[PDB]
């Protein structure tokens, strides 16, 4: 009810309120948007990015954590190549039944295929999408609430040290400056092995981000914004990359992506 003014549920503190998150984060309405042009350049960008990093770097091991997956699967897709388990969170619960409609494979659920098969181009057409599929599906082993504002952001559900965390498009998202931003990435490595590798693509210079007329804020971080926080965080960066698609005025403002890969200190 600020009607696009400023994003929904910011009128008060600056940015979109957690609550917002189970509120009007609409799963559907998120996929028919960004996963279905300039966004399915940006999912191609993701795809590749995460092919390079799990299968042709060594990112590697036996747990992934994906943090703020989403109703999204995507960001998986090449990760099970190279985790014997994932886990996959969110802090909202339609997106967790998004997924979990998904994992269950009913009918219902959003059709991932064409992304499914491009990744299967990618890996080299060693197997088709419905395989490709199948062999994440199983992969799948947790799907939990996760809030990356909190000290144990998954709370008291137990889980092993993990060899990864992933976070997709998620952070810019849940942190409303940069003192909660790298206090999330701290937060995230009480659930990584000593040395375990972090990796975060998300948008640069974007202070919103669009589902349909839905206004939701993001956090407007550059380059320097990134390396310092995730440094602070106690992380050594691997690597770091900017590109500067962006996508359409109509869902982002962004100016580019990042993509890092860091380790634990
Ligand atoms: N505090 C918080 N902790 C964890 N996830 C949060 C969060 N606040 C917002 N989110 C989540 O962040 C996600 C941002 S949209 C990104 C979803 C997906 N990973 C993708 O790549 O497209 C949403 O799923 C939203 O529910």
């Given at each position: 009810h600020?009607?696009?003014?400023?994003?929904?549920?910011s009128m008060?503190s600056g940015?979109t309120?957690?609550?917002?998150?189970?509120?009007?984060?609409?799963?559907?309405?998120y996929?028919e948007?960004?996963?279905k042009?300039?966004e399915?350049?940006?999912?191609?960008?993701?795809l590749?990015?995460?092919?390079?990093?799990?299968?042709?770097?060594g990112?590697?091991?036996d747990?992934?954590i994906?943090?703020?997956?989403?109703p999204?699967?995507?960001?998986?897709?090449?990760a099970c190549e190279?985790?014997?388990?994932?886990?996959?969170?969110?802090?909202?619960?339609?997106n967790?039944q998004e997924?979990?409609?998904?994992?269950?494979?009913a009918?219902?659920?959003?059709d991932?295929?064409?992304?499914?098969?491009?990744?299967?181009?990618?890996?080299?057409?060693?197997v088709?999408?419905?395989?490709?599929?199948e062999?994440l599906?199983?992969?799948?082993?947790?799907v939990?609430?996760?809030?990356?504002?909190q000290?144990?952001?998954?709370?008291?559900?137990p889980?092993?040290?993990?060899?990864?965390?992933?976070?997709?498009?998620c952070?810019?998202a849940?942190?409303?400056?940069?003192?909660?931003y790298?206090?999330?990435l701290?937060?995230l490595?009480?659930?990584?092995?000593?040395?375990?590798?972090?990796?975060?693509m998300?948008?640069l210079?974007?202070s919103?981000?669009?589902?349909?007329?839905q206004?939701?804020?993001?956090?407007?971080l550059?380059?320097?914004?990134?390396?310092?926080?995730?440094k602070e965080?106690g992380?050594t960066?691997?690597?770091?990359?900017?590109?500067?698609?962006s996508?359409?005025?109509?869902?982002?403002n962004?100016?580019?992506?990042?993509?890092?890969?860091?380790?634990?200190?």
């Amino acid at each position: 009810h600020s009607s696009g003014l400023v994003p929904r549920g910011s009128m008060e503190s600056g940015f979109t309120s957690k609550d917002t998150y189970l509120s009007h984060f609409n799963p559907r309405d998120y996929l028919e948007k960004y996963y279905k042009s300039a966004e399915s350049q940006i999912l191609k960008h993701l795809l590749k990015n995460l092919f390079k990093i799990f299968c042709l770097d060594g990112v590697k091991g036996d747990l992934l954590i994906d943090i703020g997956s989403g109703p999204t699967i995507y960001q998986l897709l090449s990760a099970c190549e190279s985790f014997k388990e994932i886990v996959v969170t969110d802090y909202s619960d339609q997106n967790l039944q998004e997924l979990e409609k998904w994992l269950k494979a009913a009918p219902a659920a959003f059709d991932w295929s064409p992304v499914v098969t491009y990744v299967c181009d990618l890996e080299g057409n060693r197997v088709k999408g419905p395989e490709k599929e199948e062999k994440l599906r199983q992969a799948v082993k947790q799907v939990l609430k996760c809030d990356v504002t909190q000290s144990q952001p998954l709370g008291a559900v137990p889980l092993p040290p993990a060899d990864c965390v992933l976070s997709t498009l998620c952070l810019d998202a849940a942190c409303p400056d940069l003192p909660t931003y790298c206090r999330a990435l701290r937060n995230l490595g009480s659930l990584l092995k000593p040395g375990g590798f972090l990796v975060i693509m998300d948008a640069l210079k974007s202070s919103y981000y669009m589902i349909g007329e839905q206004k939701f804020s993001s956090l407007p971080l550059g380059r320097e914004a990134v390396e310092a926080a995730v440094k602070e965080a106690g992380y050594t960066i691997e690597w770091f990359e900017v590109i500067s698609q962006s996508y359409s005025s109509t869902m982002a403002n962004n100016e580019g992506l990042f993509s890092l890969v860091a380790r634990k200190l």
